[model samples]
Target: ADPEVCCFITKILCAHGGRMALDALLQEIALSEPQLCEVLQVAGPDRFVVLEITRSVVATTRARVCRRKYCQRPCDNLHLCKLNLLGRCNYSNLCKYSHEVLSEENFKVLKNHELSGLNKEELAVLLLQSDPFFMPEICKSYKGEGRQQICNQCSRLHICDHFTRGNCRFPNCLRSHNLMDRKVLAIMREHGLNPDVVQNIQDICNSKHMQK
Candidate 1:
């Protein structure tokens, strides 16, 4: 290895815990000298390279650990969803369930818990009692999606003049001229809740607005 290559390898190994960890890592992924040299030559010797290498190594290690330690049986961790146990989680790879078997005591406690009579609200309350870290609501802030359509073909900043006069010359006008309907739909989508739920919330909000 060249001096720069040696320097890069030493830096990477040190950043990812130590030499022992790097050796273990090499067992899983082929971190050859040529690969390191190529990455260094293309990406340069910056902290960005350090971050990229570290993130890749850590992610691979974590995934391997998850597979080995948690992929056999239902994880007993109450914090994880039960559907994760059956590998039916909607989040799939993003799901953080341990996937391991629960301890006997924990398993018994979960098995004995009677949930047949509990309504959704009651169950939610129960869940809150059990896990303080659970978040009951999702943020619905506008993130610029489903808003006024931007013309993908042209680089014009202003609305098309033809569109304004209702005689747009473009065969396939992609730009959105209507602003009010688009804004309303964008706000509704951002709310995320069911239409009925949003309507009820809006009513309460309007009553408060009148009082103010």
Candidate 2:
């Protein structure tokens, strides 16, 4: 229910045009530990940022949030909170994931994480895939399910990634291009996105080049 977090994630995804080095976000975004955890939990198959940094190859979603009393830096955003989005985050106000994000918000959140180029089908695939493996950092999706399952997350608009990049060739794509779509409006209401950005996406979607 914390709309601020929603706005924060959405702001970044559109800024970078989606998909960048993991280190770049950490360096650029002024994220707190809890915020980081929220990001880790929300991101799917490491689409927001590449999980394979030269520093660490092993990553897990276990104990994503910090239970410590005096913890300085809570667990980094490495995993999703089981209780948060599924139901309600009982962590009170300290939860790493946003207090209450519907799938619509989740759709936007994942978009920011280096996955802005993904389509609705791809985003939907990542959402489903996260459940099977709990979305480990090692990424079995690439090796197992492959493109048919797709991936990422930063919580922005869930519009078509290829459309946003001005490269959508598919005429009958399913990504939301206009606010008229209930999903886009749902995101706008949940996250209270700027009308300007919304208008921008509508224009893109309405464009002759990118058909719905």
Best by TM-score: 2
| Native-referenced Cα lDDT, model 1 | 0.33
**Model 2 worst lDDT window (10 residues):** 55-64
Q: What does the lDDT read for residue 93 in candidate 1?
A: 50
Q: Tens digits of per-residue lDDT for model 2 on 158-199?
A: 455445434667676665434555645565545433444344
RMSD to the true structure for each prediction, in A, is 21.3, 17.4
Stretches of candidate 1 above 4 Å error? 1-89, 92-118, 121-192
| TM values, all candidates | 0.19, 0.23
| lDDT digits (tens) for residues 1-212 of candidate 1 | 24443334433433343222334545434667456546435533221122234322111000001223244454433334434432445775565653333435334433333222322232322332122122112223322235553333321222333332234455554544332334433543453323433332223222222333
What is each predicted model's overall lDDT from 0 to 1? 0.33, 0.38
lDDT for 93 in candidate 2 is: 44
